[PDB]
Design an enzyme around this catalytic site. Structure first.
Site, short mmCIF file in Angstrom:
data_model
loop_
_atom_site.label_atom_id
_atom_site.label_comp_id
_atom_site.label_asym_id
_atom_site.label_seq_id
_atom_site.Cartn_x
_atom_site.Cartn_y
_atom_site.Cartn_z
N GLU A 170 81.81 59.52 35.73
CA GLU A 170 81.94 58.42 34.79
C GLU A 170 80.82 57.41 35.05
O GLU A 170 80.32 56.76 34.13
CB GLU A 170 83.32 57.77 34.92
CG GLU A 170 83.58 56.58 34.01
CD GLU A 170 83.21 55.25 34.65
OE1 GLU A 170 83.47 55.08 35.86
OE2 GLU A 170 82.66 54.37 33.94
N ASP B 16 78.25 56.76 32.07
CA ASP B 16 78.12 55.41 31.55
C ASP B 16 76.68 55.15 31.11
O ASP B 16 76.43 54.63 30.02
CB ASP B 16 78.53 54.41 32.63
CG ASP B 16 79.33 53.23 32.09
OD1 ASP B 16 78.82 52.56 31.16
OD2 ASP B 16 80.45 52.98 32.59
N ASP C 148 87.23 56.80 30.30
CA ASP C 148 86.45 57.31 31.41
C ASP C 148 86.18 58.79 31.33
O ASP C 148 85.09 59.25 31.70
CB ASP C 148 87.11 56.95 32.73
CG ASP C 148 87.05 55.47 33.01
OD1 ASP C 148 85.99 54.87 32.71
OD2 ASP C 148 88.04 54.90 33.53
N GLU D 280 83.27 59.40 28.95
CA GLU D 280 82.00 59.18 29.62
C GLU D 280 81.71 60.31 30.62
O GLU D 280 80.63 60.88 30.61
CB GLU D 280 82.02 57.83 30.34
CG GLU D 280 82.17 56.66 29.40
CD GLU D 280 82.53 55.37 30.13
OE1 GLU D 280 83.58 55.35 30.82
OE2 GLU D 280 81.76 54.38 30.01
MG LIG Z 1 82.17 53.59 37.07
MG LIG Z 2 84.36 53.47 32.58
MG LIG Z 3 81.66 52.24 29.90
#
Ligand SMILES: [Mg+2]
Ligand SMILES: [Mg+2]
Ligand SMILES: [Mg+2]
Ligand SMILES: [Mg+2]
Ligand SMILES: [Mg+2]
Ligand SMILES: [Mg+2]
Ligand SMILES: [Mg+2]
Ligand SMILES: [Mg+2]
EC number: 3.1.26.3
Lengths: 219, 219
Positions: B39, B43, B106, B109
């Site tokens: 994640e 991101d 999450d 991502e």
């Molecule tokens: Mg993170």
């Molecule tokens: Mg996140």
């Molecule tokens: Mg984010």
RNA sequence: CAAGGUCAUUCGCAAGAGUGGCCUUGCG
RNA sequence: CAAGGUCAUUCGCAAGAGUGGCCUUGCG
């Protein structure tokens, strides 16, 4: 012209030299064609390159370690160090301004957006040019990475652990011209009191906090 | 199998299925192999995908407009909307947890970091898979984008313009259990004062501010 | 995006961890 | 990363813009 000299440092040749010039132009020098938007795109591109590596080589992969480190490796301070190899000061175009460390940081980022676009929006190639020039520097910076908590955070974590309370900070006075202020702050937890001063409340609250930490390491 | 069902949705097949499983596993379900680190990388990857589009299609390119909008386009709220098309609730591995809007965010991502990696770290291909699936949604949201300033900001901008002074907020009282607190805040500017309540000081301060705007623009 | 304290709740022999709420700190 | 006020300074007839400092707001 002399652009050809920067293209050699980068190790890349633009097809649209006007693009490369934009990356190098500040707002003061040209209200129509400057680097502000390319800096926007550059931020993402570079943050992504840094993160890509960080995740591969970091010794410790904890959220609490990775965030602080990533924040530094992506900071102005850090881009000025990487930008030295390129001598941007002699290519940047600015009118009545002084090429500070803020400018350089922005052109650095803008420069990478510029190469991305120019390369027909090729992300791998650009990621390659960047690593070819900075991987070593970044890999070493990571190898010796260290989270450096600031006084306020430290102090706050000591008092919450010991008493489950947070210190208080109250403004004692302000003096000087508005463009040149000096703040005197008081830090207090329990019956312990300490002062601190600096060009801002936080800088002053910080100094006051370091002194309270030592004032407690002693009491 | 069932992850083959997810691969059909994404339109990509892994070479390393366990990596795909990693992106779908929450910490409680497995302490050793879960999505936290992915994640982190995801991101950046996605941030980069959204930014690239934003700068090409955004109607307005002012930093004050692009920042707010970018804030939205990469927010949990927006990833949950994009993630609906993937039906992640049925692929995610959780132990006694509740697949909330944060978990989905999450995994979304983390899923794209996992594609990137398994793809041999091909950022172009991954950027294209992402677009084939979400460019239209993103282009639409950008088309109808609008900076939505909050009450505290609006109010502070009204008082500074008219009087060059900022309102002050003060806590009037706190009610309820610690996991369920009700706050009552007071907003004041000059001789104008109003109250506000909510589950936190901030929310409380907002309602307080909204009413102060009303009080002012009216009086 | 991270850090600390706290309340509730779940898992655990414990250590510790997960989830939700609140206070606060730092960075951008 | 953005937003607003202010001080200094540079450009300007003005509008407004750049640079540095401070107060504050929002989001992450
Ligand atoms: Mg993170
Ligand atoms: Mg996140
Ligand atoms: Mg984010
Ligand atoms: Mg910027
Ligand atoms: Mg930056
Ligand atoms: Mg910058
Ligand atoms: Mg987080
Ligand atoms: Mg900025």
């Amino acid at each position: 012209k002399m652009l050809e000299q920067l293209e050699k440092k980068l190790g890349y040749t633009f097809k649209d030299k006007s693009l490369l010039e934009k990356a190098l132009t500040h707002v003061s020098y040209s209200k129509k064609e400057h680097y502000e938007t390319l800096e926007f795109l550059g931020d993402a591109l570079v943050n992504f390159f840094i993160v890509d590596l960080l995740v591969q080589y970091s010794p410790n992969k904890r959220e609490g370690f990775l965030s602080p480190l990533k924040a530094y490796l992506i900071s102005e301070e850090f881009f000025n160090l990487l930008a030295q190899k390129l001598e941007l000061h002699k290519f940047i175009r600015i009118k009545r301004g002084k090429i500070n460390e803020t400018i350089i940081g922005d052109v650095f980022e803008a420069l990478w957006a510029a190469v991305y676009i120019d390369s027909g929006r090729d992300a791998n190639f650009t990621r390659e040019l960047f690593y070819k020039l900075f991987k070593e520097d970044i890999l070493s910076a990571i190898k010796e990475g260290r989270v450096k908590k600031d006084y306020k955070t430290i102090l706050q974590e000591i008092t919450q652990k010991r008493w489950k309370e947070r210190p208080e900070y109250r403004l004692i006075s302000v003096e000087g011209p508005h463009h040149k202020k000096k703040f005197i702050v008081e830090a207090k937890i329990k019956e312990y009191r300490t002062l601190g001063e600096g060009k801002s409340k936080k800088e002053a609250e910080q100094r006051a906090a370091e002194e309270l930490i030592k004032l407690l390491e002693e009491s």
